[PDB]
Amino acid sequence: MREIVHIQAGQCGNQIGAKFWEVISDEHGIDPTGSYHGDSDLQLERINVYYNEATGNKYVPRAILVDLEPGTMDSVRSGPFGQIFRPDNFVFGQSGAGNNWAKGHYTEGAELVDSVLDVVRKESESCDCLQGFQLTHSLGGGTGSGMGTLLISKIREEYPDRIMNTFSVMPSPKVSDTVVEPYNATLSVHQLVENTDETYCIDNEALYDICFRTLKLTTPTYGDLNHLVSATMSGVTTCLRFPGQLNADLRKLAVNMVPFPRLHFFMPGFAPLTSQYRALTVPELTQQMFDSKNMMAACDPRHGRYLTVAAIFRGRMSMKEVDEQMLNVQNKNSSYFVEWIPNNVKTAVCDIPPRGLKMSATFIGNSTAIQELFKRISEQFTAMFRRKAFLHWYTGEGMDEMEFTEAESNMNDLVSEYQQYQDAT
C-alpha cells in the first residue's frame, strides 16, 4: 500500500489531470461512478496506489483539484468522470491569477494554499505508507505555475522525506496565451529545480508539431494536445499502477533516473502515434519510441547524451524480442549514452496495453539535450527582461526586479550544468 497523492492546479493542470484520471480509470476498470467492472485481477492489484476504497466497494481517486478560478473546475465536475472525484477535494477561489506568477505564488495564491494543504493532510493521514505526490500543471500561467510551485514548497516543508513528482507543461510561442509565459516559466523552473525529484517536461511546442506534422491535424486544439499528454501520463505511470520489477515506485524511479539532484527533468516519448488498425511490430515500437518525432519536449536527443533511460512496453509481445531490440538500439547508437553510467537503459513490460492499441511503448529519458528547452525559455525571458517589458504586472504584486535577475541566473546555471556532463568523458 504505497499511496500517491495527486494534485492538479490551474486551467491546464485540471484539464490534463481530468483526462489522466479518465484514462487510467478505464484501464483499471473503474466507471464514472467509482464502481469496478473489469475482467482481470491485475487491474486491482495496485489500484490502491491512486484510488481510495470507500463504502460499497467504491474507488475514489486520491486527487485534489485546485484553482483560483472556478471556471475550469466546474467543467471537470461536469465532465465524463466528474462525479468520481471526492467533492471535498475541490478547492478553488474566485479572483483568478491572470496568468501572473506573482498572483499565484505571493498574493492570490497565498490566501488559498492553506485550505489545499488541509485536504492534502486529510488524504495523507489515511495513507498506510505515502510514497509522495504527483502534481499536474503548466508553467506559463499563474495558478498552476505560481501557486503550484508554492504548494510544492509547502508540501516539502510538511513532508520533507516524501518524493515530489510533477508533469509540467512548458510554454511555447506556437501555442501561447500571453506574452508573459517566459516570465512565469522561468520563475517556476527554479522552484522545480529545488523542490521536485522528478519532472516530466511536456513541451506544448512538441505537442503541436506532433499533432500537425505526424497526426495530420491541421488545426490542433488543446484537446488534441491533451490526448498526447493523457497517453504519455498513462505510460510513464504504468510501472506504478501494475505489478512489476522496475521503477515500481517513485523513489526507486528517482534512484534509477537522477544521477545528480538538480538534473531531474525528463523527456517523455510515446509510440505509436498514428494519424490505425495495422499491427506494430516490436522493432517498430523501439525505433519510433527513440525517434525525436515521438518526444514530448521538442529537444533533439542527438544534440546531447542520455544519462539514464526508462522504457516501458505494454501489451502481449515477445519479451525476448523486446530485449533484443532494446539492446540493438543501445549497441547501434552507444555514442549517445554516457559511458560513465554503465547499463543506464532499463526496460519494463506490462501485459495490459492502453485503450485502442494492441501494444505500445513509453519513453522516459534523462538527456542533456533538455537544455535546449531551458535555453529557449531563457532567450525569450531575456528578450523582454532586457527592456523590463511587462514587469509592472509583477512589481505591482510586490515582486522586485532582483528576483527576476536571480531566476534568470538560476536557469542559466541549470543550462551550464547540463553542458558540463554533455562533454564529460
Partner: protein, 438 residues
C-alpha cells in the same frame, strides 16, 4: 547434532529461500503441512535433518529460518504460499517501505529501526538450539535491503554470536535482470562491510544462471522462478552434507577448513552439472566422467570466469546419485591429463569428494529433468577475482563523476565510505593476483 539457522534478506534472499525450503521438504519427505511420515520420533530427535527443521509436539517440522524484507509484498507470498503451514508468523518480518535500491537507506536509515526486531526474532530460534553451528545468509548484492541491511545484520551477528560461523549465498548483479543502475555501488559497499564477518560466501551471478537457463533448459526469457529453482539445486547440493548422514562438510566450520585457507579469499566458485531440460522425453544419461568433466567448463559455473588463468587453493566434489569412488578417481585421472589445473605451491593438489546416494530431487512440474547422478564442484580459485574486477570497474566509472552519490549522502552515509570501500576491494583484487599469478 548442531542446528543451523537460515536468514533470508530482501526479495532475492526471500524468493530463493522459498525455493530452497520447497526443495528441502521434497528431499526429506516433508509435506506442505509440516508432517513427515518417515520421521518416527514424534516431536523431537537429533537426526541430521533436524539441523534445519525443528519439531513441534504435533509432529510438524518447522524450518529454522527467518525472512526479513523492508517491504511486505514479497514475504506475503510466503504467508499464502504452498508451504505457508511450515512457518509461523514470528518467522516472517516485513516493513512498510523498502530501501529503494539504496545501500545507505537499508543499512543506516531503515536498518537502524528494525535491526533490534530481527535479532530478537533470531534469538527465539537460537533459544531452541542445543548447539547452534551458525547462520546461512541469503541476500542480493544490488538490492538496498539485501546489501545494506545484510551488512548490518552480519555485524551484529558477530557481536551476539561471536563463536558461530556465518556463510553467505549472494546474488551477483547482472544487467540482464538487474533493476537498478547503482547495483555496483551496493555490491562493493556491502562486500566491504561484510568481508570481515563472513567465513565463507558463495556468489551466484545472475548472468551465469540466466545463460544456463537459456542454453540448457531452452528458456527464451528466464524468470526469477526459473533462476531460483536452479539456484536452489546448487544451494541444496552445498547444504546436503549438513542435512544428511555423511563425513564431509558435516558442520559449518568444515566449510572454512576445506575451502578457505586465507580468510579474506573466502569466495569459492560453484560449478554444477548436469542441467537437462525436462521438456525432452529421453536424454542420454551422463556418466561420472562426463559430469565431472563438465565441472571444468566455464559454461557450467555460477560465475563466468576462466579457472585456467588462475590457481586453485582447494577443490571439493559433491556428488548426488549413482556414483561410486572408483568412477570418480578414474574420471579425475583423465581430467588431469587434459585440463589446465594448477594449485598454489603451498597447497596439496587434490580433491575432497563427497557422495550422497540419493539422486537429485527436482520440483514436480519444473524445468529441470530428473537425472541418475549430478555433481557440484566447490573450488576456491583466484579466477573468481574477474567478477571483482568487472564490478570495481563499473564502480570506478560512476564514482569518478560522483553519479548517484547524493542519494547515499542524503541517507546519512559519508562520501568517504565509498572510497574506503573501494580501497578495500582494491586490496582484495591484489591478494588474488599475488596468490594465483607469477
Amino acid at each position: 547434532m548442531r542446528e543451523c539457522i537460515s536468514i533470508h534478506v530482501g526479495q532475492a534472499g526471500v524468493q530463493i529461500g522459498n525455493a530452497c525450503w520447497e526443495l528441502y521438504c521434497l528431499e526429506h519427505g516433508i509435506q506442505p503441512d509440516g508432517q513427515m511420515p518417515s520421521d518416527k520420533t514424534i516431536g523431537g530427535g537429533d537426526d541430521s535433518f533436524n539441523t534445519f527443521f525443528s519439531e513441534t509436539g504435533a509432529g510438524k517440522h518447522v524450518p529454522r529460518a527467518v525472512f526479513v524484507d523492508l517491504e511486505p509484498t514479497v514475504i506475503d507470498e510466503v504467508r499464502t504460499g504452498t508451504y505457508r503451514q511450515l512457518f509461523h508468523p514470528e518467522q516472517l518480518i516485513t516493513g512498510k517501505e523498502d530501501a529503494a535500491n539504496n545501500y545507505a537507506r537499508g543499512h543506516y536509515t531503515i536498518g537502524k529501526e528494525i535491526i533490534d526486531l530481527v535479532l530478537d526474532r533470531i534469538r527465539k530460534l537460537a533459544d531452541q538450539c542445543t548447539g547452534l553451528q551458525g547462520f546461512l545468509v541469503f541476500h542480493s548484492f544490488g538490492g538496498g535491503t539485501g546489501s545494506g541491511f545484510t551488512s548490518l545484520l552480519m555485524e551484529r551477528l558477530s557481536v551476539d554470536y561471536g563463536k558461530k560461523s556465518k556463510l553467505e549465498f549472494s546474488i551477483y548483479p547482472a544487467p540482464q535482470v538487474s533493476t537498478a543502475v547503482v547495483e555496483p555501488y551496493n555490491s562493493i559497499l556491502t562486500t566491504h562491510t561484510t568481508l570481515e564477518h563472513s567465513d565463507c560466501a558463495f556468489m551466484v551471478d545472475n548472468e551465469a544462471i540466466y545463460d544456463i537457463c537459456r542454453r540448457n533448459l531452452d528458456i527464451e526469457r528466464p524468470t526469477y522462478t526459473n533462476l531460483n529453482r536452479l539456484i536452489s539445486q546448487i544451494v541444496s547440493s552445498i547444504t546436503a552434507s549438513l542435512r544428511f548422514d555423511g563425513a564431509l562438510n558435516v558442520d559449518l566450520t568444515e566449510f572454512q577448513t576445506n575451502l578457505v585457507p586465507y580468510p579474506r579469499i573466502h569466495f569459492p566458485l560453484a560449478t554444477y552439472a548436469p542441467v537437462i531440460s525436462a521438456e525432452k522425453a529421453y536424454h542420454e544419461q551422463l556418466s561420472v566422467a562426463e559430469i565431472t568433466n563438465a565441472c571444468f567448463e566455464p559454461a557450467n559455473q555460477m560465475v563466468k570466469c576462466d579457472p585456467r588463468h588462475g590457481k586453485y587453493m582447494a577443490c571439493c566434489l559433491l556428488y548426488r546419485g549413482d556414483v561410486v569412488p572408483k568412477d570418480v578417481n578414474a574420471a579425475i585421472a583423465t581430467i588431469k591429463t587434459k585440463r589446465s589445473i594448477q594449485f598454489v605451491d603451498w597447497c596439496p593438489t587434490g580433491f575432497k569428494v563427497g557422495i550422497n546416494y540419493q539422486p537429485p530431487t527436482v520440483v514436480p512440474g519444473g524445468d529441470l529433468a530428473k537425472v541418475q547422478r549430478a555433481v557440484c564442484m566447490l573450488s576456491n580459485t583466484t579466477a573468481i577475482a574477474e567478477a571483482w574486477a568487472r564490478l570495481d570497474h563499473k564502480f570506478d566509472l560512476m564514482y569518478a563523476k560522483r553519479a548517484f552519490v547524493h542519494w547515499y549522502v542524503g541517507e546519512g552515509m559519508e562520501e568517504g565510505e565509498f572510497s574506503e570501500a573501494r580501497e578495500d576491494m582494491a586490496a582484495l583484487e591484489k591478494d588474488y593476483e599475488e596468490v594465483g599469478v607469477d
